Design a protein around this ligand. Sequence first.
Ligand SMILES: O=C(c1cccc([N+](=O)O)c1)N1CCN(S(=O)(=O)c2cccc3cnccc23)CC1
Ligand SMILES: O=C(c1cccc([N+](=O)O)c1)N1CCN(S(=O)(=O)c2cccc3cnccc23)CC1
Ligand SMILES: O=C(c1cccc([N+](=O)O)c1)N1CCN(S(=O)(=O)c2cccc3cnccc23)CC1
Ligand SMILES: O=C(c1cccc([N+](=O)O)c1)N1CCN(S(=O)(=O)c2cccc3cnccc23)CC1
Ligand SMILES: O=c1[nH]cnc2c1ncn2[C@@H]1O[C@H](COP(=O)(O)O)[C@@H](O)[C@H]1O
Ligand SMILES: O=c1[nH]cnc2c1ncn2[C@@H]1O[C@H](COP(=O)(O)O)[C@@H](O)[C@H]1O
Ligand SMILES: O=c1[nH]cnc2c1ncn2[C@@H]1O[C@H](COP(=O)(O)O)[C@@H](O)[C@H]1O
Ligand SMILES: O=c1[nH]cnc2c1ncn2[C@@H]1O[C@H](COP(=O)(O)O)[C@@H](O)[C@H]1O
Lengths: 332, 332, 332, 332
Amino acid sequence: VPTGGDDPTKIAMLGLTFDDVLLLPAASDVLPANADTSSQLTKKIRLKVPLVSSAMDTVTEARMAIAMARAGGMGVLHRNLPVAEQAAQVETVKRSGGLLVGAAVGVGDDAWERAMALRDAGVDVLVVDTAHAHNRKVLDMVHRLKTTVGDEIEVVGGNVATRAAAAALVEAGADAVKVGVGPGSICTTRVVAGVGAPQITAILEAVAACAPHGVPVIADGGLQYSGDIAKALAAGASTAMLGSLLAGTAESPGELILVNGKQFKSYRGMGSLGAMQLVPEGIEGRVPFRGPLSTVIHQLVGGLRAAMGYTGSATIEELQQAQFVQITAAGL
Amino acid sequence: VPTGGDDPTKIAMLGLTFDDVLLLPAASDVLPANADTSSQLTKKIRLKVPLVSSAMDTVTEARMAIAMARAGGMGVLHRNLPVAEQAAQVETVKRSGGLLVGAAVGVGDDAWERAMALRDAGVDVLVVDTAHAHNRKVLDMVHRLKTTVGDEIEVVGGNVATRAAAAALVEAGADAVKVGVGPGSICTTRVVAGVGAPQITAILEAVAACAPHGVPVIADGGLQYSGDIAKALAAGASTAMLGSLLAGTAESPGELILVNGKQFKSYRGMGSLGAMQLVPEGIEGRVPFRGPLSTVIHQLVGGLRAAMGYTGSATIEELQQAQFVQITAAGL
Amino acid sequence: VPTGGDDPTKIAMLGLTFDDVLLLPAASDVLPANADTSSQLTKKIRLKVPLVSSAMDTVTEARMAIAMARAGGMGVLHRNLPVAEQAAQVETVKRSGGLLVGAAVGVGDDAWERAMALRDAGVDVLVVDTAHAHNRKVLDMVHRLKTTVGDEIEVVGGNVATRAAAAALVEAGADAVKVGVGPGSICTTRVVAGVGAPQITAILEAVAACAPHGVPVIADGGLQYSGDIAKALAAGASTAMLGSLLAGTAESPGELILVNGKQFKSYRGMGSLGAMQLVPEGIEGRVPFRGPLSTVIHQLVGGLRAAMGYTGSATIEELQQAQFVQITAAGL
Amino acid sequence: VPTGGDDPTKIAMLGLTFDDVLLLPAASDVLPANADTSSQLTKKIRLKVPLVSSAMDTVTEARMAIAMARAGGMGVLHRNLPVAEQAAQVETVKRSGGLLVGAAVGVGDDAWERAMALRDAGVDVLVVDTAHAHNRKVLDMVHRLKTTVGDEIEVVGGNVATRAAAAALVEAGADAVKVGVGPGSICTTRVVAGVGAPQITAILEAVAACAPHGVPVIADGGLQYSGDIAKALAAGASTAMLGSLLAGTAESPGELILVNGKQFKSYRGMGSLGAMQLVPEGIEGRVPFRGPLSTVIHQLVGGLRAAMGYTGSATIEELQQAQFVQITAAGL
Ligand SMILES: O=C(c1cccc([N+](=O)O)c1)N1CCN(S(=O)(=O)c2cccc3cnccc23)CC1
Ligand SMILES: O=C(c1cccc([N+](=O)O)c1)N1CCN(S(=O)(=O)c2cccc3cnccc23)CC1
Ligand SMILES: O=C(c1cccc([N+](=O)O)c1)N1CCN(S(=O)(=O)c2cccc3cnccc23)CC1
Ligand SMILES: O=C(c1cccc([N+](=O)O)c1)N1CCN(S(=O)(=O)c2cccc3cnccc23)CC1
Ligand SMILES: O=c1[nH]cnc2c1ncn2[C@@H]1O[C@H](COP(=O)(O)O)[C@@H](O)[C@H]1O
Ligand SMILES: O=c1[nH]cnc2c1ncn2[C@@H]1O[C@H](COP(=O)(O)O)[C@@H](O)[C@H]1O
Ligand SMILES: O=c1[nH]cnc2c1ncn2[C@@H]1O[C@H](COP(=O)(O)O)[C@@H](O)[C@H]1O
Ligand SMILES: O=c1[nH]cnc2c1ncn2[C@@H]1O[C@H](COP(=O)(O)O)[C@@H](O)[C@H]1O
């Protein structure tokens, strides 16, 4: 084996990230303004805009969830707070009209009661929210939720970064599979544990397991530009989950911070010291202040629409069939 | 597939940019001073120097077009101004002698009248000027122009980045095909839409469709050094279109700007906020002030002549047969 | 041959370093807190934590060796001091309880007497400590030690970076093989001599020679993050030797240094000018002050435990069977 | 073709530079101090140290040539001065004892008289000194010199970067072939003309043409570290020519320059504006002041000796058979 040892499977693939590829233009009759950006979040739920906000305490509470839903996407409420308060945030969202909302739950001992309280509050989507879903406890939670509340609530499981893990969630009854182990902007798992999977390859692999079963893939983490949304969807994802790109908005939790004459907001991993309060797998950082959510979503969707024009994609389902060119470090 | 999924066509190629390759020296009896730098701009029009200036409002108005023609190249007048004023710029150029001039038109509702006014003003070349020519409206415009004014005016279509798109323009009747989706120095399409094609590969692909039909390729965007002109032509282009490299010259529109004791000129994408005045796909920047055009062209052509000496290319047609070595990130 | 000449063996492999790969998550029933981190240092000696401190005069003297042993690892006492003083350091360690300790010896004329004095002092492990063990003098020293004191002392030989060199040490009777030629943070061998081997490939190759003979591999040099420990072990090493990562700790030799308001400690190669006091193959530098050893080891082991959770590795022997994905320069 | 077009020969190879490879250690009985560093400069001339100084006006005049010869290498006197003065520099060198010396000549109209004056002055080596030797005028000059003064003077031709060009010089009667088109530290040919060849690949290719005819290869340009000398020789070169590495020495022409509290010397390409006094293919820069030549050579040879120890190379001829590992951008 060219890279060492005698086992060709030891280094099992070459992982590509968003920056490694560009979408190729193709024959097009599609004007950006007329593209249909709707897409499946889950088997049953279709969003007008294929974007959901991260389940993080510096990204999504009620205000963000309301704004995301009004913009045609959805928020996933974070779970770093008492069950009663999270359920109260769900009720706050539902009191602003017929707005979709999701909420994260873990697999710990309080997870089941949390899930039931969220169900009682009218949640539309439960996200079984872990760093590594290829685990019996996570698969069992997904299955139990689907068998118990599955007729009224869509159940998302994650996160995964391999075909086999995606396949396991599908078998457990997941209504969507969330992909991303290691790619988050505030993630240190790659350096702390040495574990991860570049996101374009992770999506291609997860999609290979999920698409044949009609299960949508949510691309979660590592998206830094509007163009990355188009790349994620072209790799076969049905929606993208955004943390960093939304953390600087007015609607995210937290105050405005002024450093060196510039405006920022705090953005921190849920595995950071501050969020857990230990072996942290996230950092506490800041992102530039970006103004209203509605405006940020406009620009993100605008970039997606441009990509749909260039690739001749009238719908997100067509964009999922677009082709890439791999680029070098020289090219950017 | 090593990079993910089961479809070998999903990542369809490895795209190389100028920085990824160098021209190999070959046996030579050619002195740089004696090389013939002439080349086809279009099927009928041969330039003394294989260089044309970008159709941009910080690059080419009448003064630049006149200087480019006198230097042996050509200018393409930008279309970000009223039809009457663009036609007046054509007449200004033709009043400075028997100088070649081109002018850009779009495919919007005013495009046809603009084209006819330019024809009336004596324009030699019409450039159907879009970001993505693989589209029925663009192909129809190229065809209608060729069938209507084609005996007196050469019609260029662009831009493309794939073999199939180049082939479509050829079939529509293009007299030249302009290549470049995403590579411009001021371009943000790669990050906003996630779309693009590294330019050496784009030229190789377009040439594969155009050369067998005797249609010249204009390499447009991403050229940062005189050596890139030689690389573009060796990849099979017949001319290069330059924006950034010419924007700092005396003859470009705009004033001199002084920042930190150094001289610059403004250079902005036609898809920037300022040019359109929205989802911008270009930035507004600056380039170092470079002095007279004639002098910049001297240095650019000087580099091209050096490359022709090293590669044993007596003519541009011979340079189109030169070979490359691919280099690593370490090498530069 | 694509890279030049006609000999495919001239460039014999593509060498990967830690930064070139990530560990892939796999199905897991393993909680980080419950993983078994124990591993073979040598054929007979199993450590609770698979970490040993470098035999360097800015890393390991008695205080460090004691702290490493108490933390479940081991120290290798440096040999840049008189024989009597090194033996006295061994006795200091053994007087702090039943603590494992190793000590470095060379192959020069004083090496044999040094080894015997260390034996007399109660040393558990002798490390034949060279930059290049594929040499008759080094193999002879390993063999003579194993035949003379091998029943009471485990003998480590190093360093190697190739399969053949590892095989030679195995044949000579080594109880462990230490891998690393060129990768150390303070190493300049790569630039001074132009010699080296990227560490992931070096480990894969050495393991191919050592594992079939039941000889553990110690990965020595180039580890910069806790995640690199997991990568080294997954490549097949049984323990990791750390210099830079431990040099900033309270227990390392040397004083605290204050520069620009920040705390550091000196860290220098044993091939640096200062250590030898010539053609140096190491530099004299500094590392950030890190606090107590016990705390640094906690974080390092914490990262390893996280990796074991993600990869479903209940033991280090299972982690040695984990798989990698190769990443690009874009990905990190 | 993965990189574009339908012609697999268009991008003819992947070119590696020094930074792309490391030498692999191999079984060794060689101590650095006992390696034999002697090597053929030309078919007849063997140097004690395989190093020659560049024919540049900021590197080699009489003082440098004398010091290089005393150190066991050789200087090549630059030709940017009147014939009478260059010949006088040769006589100055020969008046310091039985010291080898070379001198550069071009192929212009004064080249033949220059060569004869140098012959009359007692020069040992004539270097036909061009940027591109694959040219009838250069091959003719090499041949005419070899047929006219070849019994008393060794004739070097250069520079080349391809197998075919090297083969042409061999056929013309060259006693050595000098390799390097584009790699020099002060070279801008790669950016001005877009022409070049990464040096490890260039050496491998030239050696494939030269070694079977017993013609030594001089690796000229791009060497930045002592380790690069070992890499160049292992790729099959017999000597290395150094510009930048020797330009900072006391013996080079030019004065000491003080900027920002640090000492430098001017170092400029022979294709720079200043040297020619136009389309320059070199820059005028500076290098850190390095002290006496003898000391710099000691360190360079020291690194080479280290490499010979690691690779088990008793002689330069053995080092020419050593193997490489290719490294990634991550590895350094
Ligand atoms: O009409 C569009 C547009 C937007 C989205 C999709 C689309 N399409 O065709 O499917 C078309 N635009 C107008 C202006 N351009 S541009 O930035 O100014 C520009 C001009 C010329 C050469 C380009 C080469 N590559 C990039 C962009 C270039 C981009 C946006
Ligand atoms: O005669 C030419 C010239 C120009 C253009 C083409 C050409 N040719 O041969 O086809 C020849 N020049 C004179 C001086 N050189 S140089 O920069 O000084 C220089 C000198 C020696 C080693 C070189 C190694 N690679 C790069 C350049 C080097 C370049 C320009
Ligand atoms: O439970 C664990 C843990 C630790 C070690 C091993 C392990 N396991 O499953 O085998 C699990 N953690 C809790 C929180 N996360 S996280 O950083 O906050 C985080 C959250 C969501 C998405 C992630 C995507 N990739 C990285 C980390 C992400 C990491 C640590
Ligand atoms: O004996 C030599 C030497 C020199 C040249 C050739 C040679 N040989 O064996 O063929 C041997 N040295 C003494 C000390 N080392 S070291 O820098 O301190 C050092 C120590 C331990 C681990 C190393 C891992 N890779 C690099 C160097 C390391 C290098 C120089
Ligand atoms: O602390 C952490 N470490 C690693 N990943 C995290 C952490 N917190 C959240 N994440 C994940 O990172 C995603 C956001 O990534 P981003 O959009 O690149 O900032 C989130 O949706 C999570 O999947
Ligand atoms: O706003 C923009 N976004 C992307 N491409 C542009 C824009 N404006 C002009 N271009 C193209 O970029 C070319 C100039 O590229 P440059 O020479 O690299 O600066 C122009 O000829 C256009 O093809
Ligand atoms: O001077 C030196 N040059 C090269 N390698 C050294 C030197 N001194 C120690 N080493 C090796 O570098 C290892 C530490 O590497 P680090 O953990 O990356 O800092 C040590 O265990 C040695 O194997
Ligand atoms: O102006 C120049 N442009 C390109 N190459 C040059 C020039 N002047 C000298 N050279 C070559 O560069 C070599 C020195 O390269 P260096 O050792 O990397 O600095 C010289 O021996 C020449 O072969």
